[PDB]
From Swiss-Prot, chains B, E, H, I, J:
UniProt name for this protein: Alpha-conotoxin LvIA
Coiled coil regions, renumbered to chain: none
Main function: Alpha-conotoxins act on postsynaptic membranes, they bind to the nicotinic acetylcholine receptors (nAChR) and thus inhibit them. This toxin blocks alpha-3-beta-2/CHRNA3-CHRNB2 nAChR with high selectivity (IC(50)=8.67 nM (on rat) and 17.5 (on human)). Also has weaker activity on alpha-6/alpha-3-beta-2-beta-3 (CHRNA6/CHRNA3-CHRNB2-CHRNB3) (IC(50)=108 nM (on rat)), alpha-6/alpha-3-beta-4 (CHRNA6/CHRNA3-CHRNB4) (IC(50)=121 nM (on rat)), alpha-3-beta-4 (CHRNA3-CHRNB4) (IC(50)=148 nM (on rat)), and alpha-7/CHRNA7 nAChRs (IC(50)=3000 nM (on rat)).
Subcellular localization, as worded in the UniProt entry: Secreted
Full-sequence range covered: 21 to 36 of 37
Family indicated by similarity: Belongs to the conotoxin A superfamily.
Record organism: Conus lividus (Livid cone)
Domain notes: The cysteine framework is I (CC-C-C). Alpha4/7 pattern.
Annotated region (Ser-Xaa-Pro motif, crucial for potent interaction with nAChR), positions in chain: 4-6
Positions of disulphide bridges: 2-8, 3-16
Further information: Negative results: does not block alpha-9-alpha-10/CHRNA9-CHRNA10, alpha-2-beta-2/CHRNA2-CHRNB2, alpha-2-beta-4/CHRNA2-CHRNB4, alpha-3-beta-4/CHRNA3-CHRNB4, alpha-4-beta-2/CHRNA4-CHRNB2, alpha-4-beta-4/CHRNA4-CHRNB4, alpha-6/alpha-3-beta-2-beta-3 (CHRNA6/CHRNA3-CHRNB2-CHRNB3), alpha-6-beta-4/CHRNA6-CHRNB4, and alpha-1-beta-1-epsilon-delta/CHRNA1-CHRNB1-CHRNE-CHRND.
Lineage: Eukaryota, Metazoa, Spiralia, Lophotrochozoa, Mollusca
């Protein structure tokens, strides 16, 4: 019952070594999704803007697979995100260290898929001049792996539209559009694809 | 919808 | 009988594995109650407001039961909550990470019941306009589990009235009402209940 | 002989389990005394005052006894405050979590005695309006246990006069009076004493 | 009353 | 495959003693390279300015060598920077503790060479007077080892030009020059070289 | 030969119980010296001043002696200051907890003496009134043991002049004098010397 | 005036 | 170029 | 002027 989940958790985490990270010969693809919750604060004297959002991260590890027959028909569970390997998806133009607003607990299912949704608050580089106007301003921040190239981490988005269905209605900024575009970049020197997700949001103060 | 509240998104990767 | 309490804490904590979290066939009920202590600051330039409150949470694990006779007639004890599993209950519209203002120490009873009342200071998204008014403004924040649905963790309130009997007499804001309403959310997509407790407060500066 | 003291530190802390907290069949008495050092900042837009003070606390516990000639005449020693159980004396109307300005080191005596004096800076709820008058303001913040009632922790004050002999001479605030008075509270529902010590201070800007 | 001071409420889940 | 990399991580990290640091009989050369990303903030009232930069550090250790043929042709891998010894390059005129903006994940190759690129935000001493002018200000901060002299840690730059190619286009300041020069220092008293890298950057507002 | 220092590090720290602190029977002498780098910020609304300085502390311990010929002629080594017992000097008029600007790494020599120079930023009580006169202001802070009396820790300064040869030329306040005078204080009740080193600095805005 | 300096108070519970 | 993005820079110590 | 830079001070307790 609970015995079965203590037993499968014990067979997945105490037995095996820690997963050592993706390689060229056994790479992995992470899928990203942002749910944007509030444009909290804009700062014209430094051009840094503060966002609160949900980042939906999802990947698949063969070492986290298991067969439900063996475990009282159990099919998924939640665990501390510290108990499992997680990716190094990081904001590329952040200006302070990111703040976690939520528990960090991932869901693991028998195919070896893990979904993980940290709610975060981020400061990043953005010039706000024009937030007054009816046009608004546009900001962009890219996310991607910090050490792994495209040959080891692939990123993928399920949609190009940032989910604005839980944006704070009476925020200090109106959201006009919000896109999560996936981008690849090559350099002359080098074979490798470099993949990032570009979060572009266009906004203005309310009126 | 479901994909905006994380308690829902994790229970339904089928959907989110 | 300090020996006797040494003995019981040692039979319940280094003995069995960590309780691995609620599941759908052994669900669990967390009871919430807020006693509000002060509205310390409202911010009109960001629409975030700061609270100090005690969040009283209560649940019941069979993994913590014991017979008083076998342990010198003792009926409860206190422990650091780090020694025990705690629920997942998060503010949904938080805007910076919560600050715990009190020790985090739980009380356990031979029943298998746990009480835990951390004092917290929380910033959350709220438009203050109209606080200068007679009519005041209304803010709301929902609390709920962040990874578990209603099928594994249920929330419940003992009362719908937030306890204000220890609210700061010289605050900068008066409380007009304060409610603890638990709500259910269903979706088209899925059977499962999604459960939250909605903290609703109507307040005004002081005239 | 450092050897004699290393052997006593090992015989008190390594191979007995840590003391499990006060019970009702062996309660405990903590004595608090405040040395007030400076009113550093007042904030009228939030009604918070910031204090810098030494909180000297002292209590007594049998698990720390020894006789000195059985360890080569030693009767006192200093140890990290983390090596030993401490009471959970916390300010009740604090608004930010306390920051310690001092090392946390206790001195413990052969009779079993521990004394511990942390320097802290505390933000707490206090309405300052009227501070720049000749009359002054009065603030109050109470300290007490957060999880134990009077039947398990009782408080004593050695004096009702907070020590002002170390208040910063060139501070921004005079102190007119400052008290550490013990208070006991019953509620109708319940037999038990709930005991705290109330720090009351009267202060004004410096002419 | 009691349910307002946490040292009281934890000793009395009966009420609070 | 992964088995082969887990086995290589195990043979290098727990099976060996902690690396004890470079000595005089085995000096070590860490090469530094900075890519400057944004001048976030200038503070004219205190003369401190805040930078966001990438610090690329690289060193070689014989204790990190391995033969690829005995580990499935593996030639490089990544590990958390906590798993390995890191040099103590410090900003010398910093005025706050630096903030880490990125994961700290290093790459080590069968050569025994390590590259590590943490993104940081640093506040440091600089008089901004002359920024509003058309010739601007120039600021400098030196980096070097804080306890090792030149006889145990040598520093090196691969180039004297700071890499600006990802400087924030819509930042609040423009860079006229940016150089990273190594410096040697002897004193009257003493044999040893004292080695630092001086990055001096010349900047101006956007007009 | 690093084998020789791993062997010596392993024999000083793994073999033995941690030094249990100085006693009346085996006391200890700490030598302090301040290198002052910048008065970064003063504010007259709170009478707090912010200093950035290196405090060089130095002491000698028998338990850290070793004979070089028994360890391949090794004379000194570096270790993180967490590997060793460190003294308790603390600012007595601090207002916020100190910020460490540098690595905390000590060097120990074969006689058992250890030297350690952390860079720090400290906020402390000081009334700035008169800083843009020419007469300047004078501020003071005493440092000392927070728990050990003179009979267990002695303080000693090798010079009474705070080292200014590294003071920031373009800071916004400038030092007229800076002294580190050792002080002893007895009181009637008590035999023991209670000793401190008193840091006095006289400073002014740019003429 | 011992009870104002913490190094003194801890050495003398006898007084402070 | 490549030496401005850290994910590229560590893959090519040859160049960066 | 060795005694103002901590990397110099630690190598040389004789002087600083």
């Amino acid at each position: 019952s609970q015995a079965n989940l203590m037993r499968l958790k014990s067979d997945l985490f105490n037995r095996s070594p820690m997963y050592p990270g993706p390689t060229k010969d056994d790479p992995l693809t992470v899928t990203l999704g942002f749910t944007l919750q509030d444009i909290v604060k804009v700062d014209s004297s430094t051009n840094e803007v503060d966002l609160v959002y949900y980042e939906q991260q999802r990947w698949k590890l063969n070492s986290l697979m298991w067969d439900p027959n063996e475990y009282g028909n159990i099919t998924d569970f939640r665990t501390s995100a510290a108990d499992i390997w997680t990716p190094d998806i990081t904001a590329y133009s952040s200006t302070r260290p990111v703040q976690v607003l939520s528990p960090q607990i991932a869901v693991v299912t028998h195919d070896g898929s893990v979904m993980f949704i940290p709610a975060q608050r981020l400061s990043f580089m953005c010039d706000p001049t024009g937030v007054d106007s009816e046009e608004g301003v546009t900001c962009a921040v890219k996310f991607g792996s910090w050490v792994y190239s495209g040959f080891e981490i692939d990123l993928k988005t399920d949609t190009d539209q940032v989910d604005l269905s839980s944006y704070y209605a009476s925020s200090k900024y109106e959201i006009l559009s919000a896109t999560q575009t996936r981008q690849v970049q090559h350099y002359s020197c080098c074979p490798e694809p470099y993949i990032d997700v570009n979060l572009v949001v266009k906004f203005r103060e309310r009126r | 919808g479901c994909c905006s509240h994380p308690a829902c998104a994790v229970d339904h990767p089928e959907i989110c």
